[PDB]
Amino acid sequence: IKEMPQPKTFGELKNLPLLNTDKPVQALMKIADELGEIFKFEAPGRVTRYLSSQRLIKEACDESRFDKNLSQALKFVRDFAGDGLFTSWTHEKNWKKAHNILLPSFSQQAMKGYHAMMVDIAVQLVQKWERLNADEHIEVPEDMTRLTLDTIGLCGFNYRFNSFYRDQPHPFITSMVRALDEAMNKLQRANPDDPAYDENKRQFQEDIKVMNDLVDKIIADRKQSDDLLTHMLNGKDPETGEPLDDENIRYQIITFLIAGHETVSGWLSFALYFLVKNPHVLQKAAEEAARVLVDPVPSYKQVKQLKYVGMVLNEAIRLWPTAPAFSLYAKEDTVLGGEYPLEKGDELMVLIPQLHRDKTIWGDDVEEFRPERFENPSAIPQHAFKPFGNGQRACIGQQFSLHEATLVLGMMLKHFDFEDHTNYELDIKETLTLKPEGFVVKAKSKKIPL
Amino acid sequence: TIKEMPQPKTFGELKNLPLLNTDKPVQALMKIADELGEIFKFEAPGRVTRYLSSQRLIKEACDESRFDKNLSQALKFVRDFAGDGLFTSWTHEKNWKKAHNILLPSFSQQAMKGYHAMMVDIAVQLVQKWERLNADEHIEVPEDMTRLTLDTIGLCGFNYRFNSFYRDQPHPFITSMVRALDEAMNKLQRANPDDPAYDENKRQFQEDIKVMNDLVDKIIADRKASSDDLLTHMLNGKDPETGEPLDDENIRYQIITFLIAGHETVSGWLSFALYFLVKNPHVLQKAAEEAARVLVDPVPSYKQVKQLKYVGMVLNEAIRLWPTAPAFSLYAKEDTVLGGEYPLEKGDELMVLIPQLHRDKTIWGDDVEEFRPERFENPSAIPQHAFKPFGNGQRACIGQQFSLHEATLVLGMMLKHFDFEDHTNYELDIKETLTLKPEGFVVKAKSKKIPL
Numbered sequence A: 001i002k003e004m005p006q007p008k009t010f011g012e013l014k015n016l017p018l019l020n021t022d023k024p025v026q027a028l029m030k031i032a033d034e035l036g037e038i039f040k041f042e043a044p045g046r047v048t049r050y051l052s053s054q055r056l057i058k059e060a061c062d063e064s065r066f067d068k069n070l071s072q073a074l075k076f077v078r079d080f081a082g083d084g085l086f087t088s089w090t091h092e093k094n095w096k097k098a099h100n101i102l103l104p105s106f107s108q109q110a111m112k113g114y115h116a117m118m119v120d121i122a123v124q125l126v127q128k129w130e131r132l133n134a135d136e137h138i139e140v141p142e143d144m145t146r147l148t149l150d151t152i153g154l155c156g157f158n159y160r161f162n163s164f165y166r167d168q169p170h171p172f173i174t175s176m177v178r179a180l181d182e183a184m185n186k187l188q189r190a191n192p193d194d195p196a197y198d199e200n201k202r203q204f205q206e207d208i209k210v211m212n213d214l215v216d217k218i219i220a221d222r223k224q225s226d227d228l229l230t231h232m233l234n235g236k237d238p239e240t241g242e243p244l245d246d247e248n249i250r251y252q253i254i255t256f257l258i259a260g261h262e263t264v265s266g267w268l269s270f271a272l273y274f275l276v277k278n279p280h281v282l283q284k285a286a287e288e289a290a291r292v293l294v295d296p297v298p299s300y301k302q303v304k305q306l307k308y309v310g311m312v313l314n315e316a317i318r319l320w321p322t323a324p325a326f327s328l329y330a331k332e333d334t335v336l337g338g339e340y341p342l343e344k345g346d347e348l349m350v351l352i353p354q355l356h357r358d359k360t361i362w363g364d365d366v367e368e369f370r371p372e373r374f375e376n377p378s379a380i381p382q383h384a385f386k387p388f389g390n391g392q393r394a395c396i397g398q399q400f401s402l403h404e405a406t407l408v409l410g411m412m413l414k415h416f417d418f419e420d421h422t423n424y425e426l427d428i429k430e431t432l433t434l435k436p437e438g439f440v441v442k443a444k445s446k447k448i449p450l
Numbered sequence B: 001t002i003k004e005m006p007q008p009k010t011f012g013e014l015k016n017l018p019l020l021n022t023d024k025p026v027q028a029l030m031k032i033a034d035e036l037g038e039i040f041k042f043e044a045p046g047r048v049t050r051y052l053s054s055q056r057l058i059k060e061a062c063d064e065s066r067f068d069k070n071l072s073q074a075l076k077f078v079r080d081f082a083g084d085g086l087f088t089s090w091t092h093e094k095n096w097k098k099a100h101n102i103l104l105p106s107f108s109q110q111a112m113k114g115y116h117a118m119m120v121d122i123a124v125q126l127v128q129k130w131e132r133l134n135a136d137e138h139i140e141v142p143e144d145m146t147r148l149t150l151d152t153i154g155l156c157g158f159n160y161r162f163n164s165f166y167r168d169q170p171h172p173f174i175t176s177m178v179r180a181l182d183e184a185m186n187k188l189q190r191a192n193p194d195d196p197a198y199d200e201n202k203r204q205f206q207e208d209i210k211v212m213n214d215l216v217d218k219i220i221a222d223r224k225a226s227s228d229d230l231l232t233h234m235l236n237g238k239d240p241e242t243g244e245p246l247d248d249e250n251i252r253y254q255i256i257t258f259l260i261a262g263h264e265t266v267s268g269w270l271s272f273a274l275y276f277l278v279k280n281p282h283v284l285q286k287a288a289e290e291a292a293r294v295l296v297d298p299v300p301s302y303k304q305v306k307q308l309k310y311v312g313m314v315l316n317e318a319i320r321l322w323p324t325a326p327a328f329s330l331y332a333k334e335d336t337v338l339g340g341e342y343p344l345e346k347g348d349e350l351m352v353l354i355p356q357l358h359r360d361k362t363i364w365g366d367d368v369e370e371f372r373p374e375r376f377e378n379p380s381a382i383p384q385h386a387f388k389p390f391g392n393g394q395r396a397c398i399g400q401q402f403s404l405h406e407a408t409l410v411l412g413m414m415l416k417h418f419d420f421e422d423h424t425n426y427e428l429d430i431k432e433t434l435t436l437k438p439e440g441f442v443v444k445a446k447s448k449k450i451p452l
């Protein structure tokens, strides 16, 4: 039962200066590489422990001892998402209520309903790229969020953002980035009440009104369908017989627009990066897509058969998990790993990109992109691969993402050949999530019609 | 016949508490009363209470020899900032009867003639706000009603001007007060009060207590500068029974109590009164007939307000359907049997479900859900204890004369100066803090172009 490592302190500022970058998650990974499986991290008022090894995280994922915690990041995001599924505490009224009301919308059969609409937007993406003249290129992260925002909008709410009819980023997304960017910058503000932050605070509200105005436009377009929005309005709580409060329903819409398109958007962009940097892996998935997608538009069953594309997807999110961390707190007093005592209420952070690079589980080539590690999904021991959270607070849209990413990635491989014409150097922008910045490619159409 | 009491589904050691995990508990209890009848038991971990809905038993609960006002768990939570004020006091406490005798003079008929000028001040400000809206704009009723009623309690009670109509967003006192009242209501439904989910709530609650006290510190200090209003009786008056004036801790509680109770239920009341009228245009047209008839001066006099009797009936039929203070609690002085059927031990508590009492078919007929102001044309015809929107007995509402005069004046001038359009076909949505208000009620107002 020994003492815990800790990085450099700056007097009364503690460890806060060490995350004084636009890339805090990558700075924590360096500290993890420098200090190991666990280290203590102090801020003016907060203290947290970062876990990097599967040995300690395996006990942290035990729901008998640990419960989902709202990190200082989520408490700031709660300023515009409120008590929706992502930023809710487990033991507060609306998490249980809404979790059970929304869960039918993510069943395997609900996915069959989404498929036609997912195919709608994916065809729009293929048609955008097929109409590029020979000199033009593609901005990967921008066209992916065009697609992922449109999917969550059409399937969830029957609302058309028409992102492909906008050369500019969609206004909802542009202020959302600023709101998520603001939240992350507040984690680095020592004294958030300095007058210097008065422009920053007023812009922050300006961006929330933009997010709420769109939601009221989504609500006004309804009040003919059995989508996710019908379920928010109509589902009863079995114990009380009542539907979700209107203020919560606005909160869940925001949550799904954000969590339901950004992490999928980063995902697809990373998968395209690793393919275009590993050209043999790209032709093996291109062979599978040419084999399985035999129709002008894909069917639901065909997506289920793109086994190798799926492994590409799992190996990308292993290397770069687009939601990079989740937080826990100590239900009751306990000792961690038989060496580290924790009092009730002590907080842990699972550093997901560090868990997925644990040499002791994945072998001594953790940093290489090898999709063939997931040819045997069962081989990997429990709690070693945690890109979607843990337990009852794990990602509810866990199958929706996989189907959307697989379908979209499948059709791109069927219809285009991709050249990394600039020799792109991977640069990971951090909002609270991860995405490659300025990643561009060229796509020669294989001239297969739709 | 002595009989066992109805009780809805139980959820283990949580008892009946899961049933009220909603944003609108009073309308949920009206659903339970509708299905289990005139009385049911409701259990929570530490507490037990029985909810009454029918006049036959509620007239029995209104017997002051057997039952005395009880502080429900909701009132005990408000006591965290209302303290020893009139509303959160036990009848047997030293500071209830003391403060009651000191402040009751301020709500007399003789005081009412003095307030009339100040009420007109606020009311004219509201009229002028609506006359200066551009053609496309609309009116959010509860927000402008709180602007009116709060400015009224400030000026009439403390000679203090909140200037709520010179503000775009709510007054900061109003936001901190509602968040405090919202907290108090939500602590009632909460299973595990030490869960980390509630640290922000405890923080924010304390943040909201300091702002309400700071504002009271501004009112008290602003007088040490400078009258014969309610605050003068608080500071200078002495109790006629004991010859003691009020404790300085207690005076701070009385100012808070009157800021809350002296504007919140009147603003909801007017909002509902305006709601039912845009929904019954024959009733609305009849009420503007009387206001155009009686209010012949640019501003109304005290005598003219007392001559608006149909407008008053509109207000009474409004508050029957939606009593903005929806319940009050009682406890049993001694062991007694209620209705000859339900035995109660000494100290057991009761709750009066006022919107259900006002929905008794045995008293009001088979159209209790219809908005008919003409039930109040015959003042004597109502049975006793059938209409209890202002509490009971010695703990009844001290300002019901005050509220009625304020509400009737404002409702009267609105009818004289405007035509009201329900341009959205507004669907009634009743937000619950601990009181009742319509939430998103909006209307448009055509100026009748009558000068002031």
Ligand code: FDE
Pocket: A068, A085, A086, A087, A099, A255, A256, A259, A260, A261, A263, A264, A267, A322, A323, A325, A326, A327, A386, A387, A388, A389, A390, A392, A393, A394, A395, A396, A397, A398, A400, A401
């Ligand atoms: C719609 C959608 C879509 C999606 C996607 C995704 C991707 C790609 C990735 C991801 C992730 C994730 N998620 Fe995700 N997602 C979603 C969602 C969600 C929600 C709602 C949540 C929360 C849940 C609960 O709690 O209930 C999540 C969730 C999630 C998580 C966890 C959180 C915490 O904090 O714990 C993670 C890690 N997600 N994700």
Ligand code: FDE
Pocket: B069, B086, B087, B100, B257, B258, B261, B262, B263, B265, B266, B269, B324, B325, B327, B328, B329, B388, B389, B390, B391, B392, B394, B395, B396, B397, B398, B399, B400, B402, B403
């Ligand atoms: C100033 C003012 C104004 C007013 C108004 C009103 C309206 C509109 C309604 C109402 C109500 C009421 N209230 Fe009212 N109000 C007031 C007040 C008051 C007070 C102070 C009280 C307490 C009394 C004794 O107890 O002493 C009341 C009170 C009252 C009541 C009772 C409570 C109990 O718990 O019992 C009720 C129900 N209120 N309200």
